[PDB]
């Protein structure tokens, strides 16, 4: 059976317990932690591409008030449907399964200025999602998984000083 397991789940949950935050900038910022997954149950002989996108979690934005995240108003129109293609794509099942698949180079941005970045709305919550697309398939088979441990709020600057400190501690 296909299994796509979050790596460093305990590390992600340390961030989630605080409410995780990811910086978005004009030129784009790499994530910490990095999204990494282990894969079993692909056809080792088949070819697949791995995609990453971010699902909007709420019908509202968030705000950090008196050290707490609370509902912060009506949402901005949904960020454009941006997909990040893992640079090892396309590749054999055996490639994806031999070692964890890391999305170390994806950049999160608040400005459409190219460079395969992902645009997110500041103060909105997102859940990372990985897609596995089968190559050369007339049915264009795709399998999608979200990682609830990896939910975060996009921010232009860290709100929670405990997040600032955790980013420094573990990175
Ligand atoms: C930019 C873009 O085209 N994104 C995208 C579109 C469709 C899907 C999809 C369709 S059926 C399934 N499980 N996922 C995933 C990602
Ligand atoms: C059955 C089906 O809906 N297949 C599907 C959907 C979306 C994608 C996709 C979105 S962005 C990208 N590079 N590939 C691939 C395959």
């Amino acid at each position: 059976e296909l299994r796509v397991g979050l790596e460093e789940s305990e590390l992600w949950l340390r961030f989630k317990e605080l409410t995780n935050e990811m910086i978005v900038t004009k030129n784009g910022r790499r994530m910490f932690p990095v999204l990494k997954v282990n894969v079993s149950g692909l056809d080792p002989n088949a070819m697949y591409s791995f995609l990453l996108d971010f699902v909007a979690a709420d019908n509202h934005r968030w705000k950090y008030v008196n050290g707490e995240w609370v509902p912060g108003g009506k949402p901005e129109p949904q960020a454009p449907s941006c997909v990040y293609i893992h640079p090892d794509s396309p590749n054999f099942g055996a490639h994806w399964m031999k070692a964890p698949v890391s999305f170390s180079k994806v950049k999160l941005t608040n400005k459409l200025n190219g460079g395969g970045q992902i645009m997110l709305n500041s103060l909105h919550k997102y859940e990372p999602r990985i897609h596995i697309v089968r190559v050369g398939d007339p049915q264009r088979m795709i399998t999608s998984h979200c990682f609830p441990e990896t939910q975060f709020i996009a921010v232009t600057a860290y709100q929670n000083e405990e997040i600032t400190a955790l980013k420094i501690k573990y990175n």
Side-chain angles (χ1 to χ4, degrees):
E1 200 73 10
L2 175 60
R3 289 166 63 109
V4 182
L6 182 62
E7 293 272 325
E8 300 178 5
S9 61
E10 183 165 354
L11 172 58
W12 279 104
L13 281 304
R14 286 192 204 282
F15 284 89
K16 187 170 171 171
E17 113 168 271
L18 302 183
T19 305
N20 201 355
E21 305 180 38
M22 298 285 176
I23 303 294
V24 294
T25 68
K26 175 178 152 200
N27 297 319
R29 184 71 60 82
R30 284 176 288 275
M31 298 171 65
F32 187 84
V34 170
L35 185 59
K36 306 178 217 63
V37 297
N38 56 66
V39 183
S40 67
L42 290 176
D43 180 350
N45 311 308
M47 296 192 83
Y48 305 91
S49 300
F50 273 55
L51 320 174
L52 168 66
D53 68 2
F54 297 81
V55 173
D58 313 299
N59 70 352
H60 68 260
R61 76 180 85 180
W62 289 92
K63 62 170 139 52
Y64 197 68
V65 178
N66 301 327
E68 303 318 325
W69 285 101
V70 297
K74 283 202 145 200
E76 289 163 32
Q78 287 225 289
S81 298
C82 293
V83 166
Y84 178 79
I85 301 172
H86 192 285
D88 293 0
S89 306
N91 226 320
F92 292 106
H95 173 89
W96 301 113
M97 295 188 282
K98 72 186 180 173
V101 184
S102 174
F103 287 85
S104 60
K105 305 310 198 179
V106 64
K107 288 183 170 179
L108 308 185
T109 192
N110 61 173
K111 279 272 199 303
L112 44 259
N113 60 8
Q117 290 165 65
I118 302 268
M119 180 146 77
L120 302 177
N121 298 322
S122 54
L123 300 186
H124 296 65
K125 184 178 288 190
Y126 294 95
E127 184 160 341
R129 177 167 62 182
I130 291 165
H131 312 278
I132 303 174
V133 178
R134 190 159 56 190
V135 170
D137 181 2
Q139 297 191 108
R140 290 98 96 91
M141 186 183 188
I142 179 164
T143 309
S144 313
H145 289 84
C146 57
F147 306 91
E149 300 93 342
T150 72
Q151 290 167 1
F152 64 85
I153 301 176
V155 298
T156 62
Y158 292 135
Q159 304 296 288
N160 183 356
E161 79 294 336
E162 290 201 325
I163 285 292
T164 305
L166 240 226
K167 297 272 179 162
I168 289 167
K169 184 166 164 64
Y170 286 115
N171 194 12

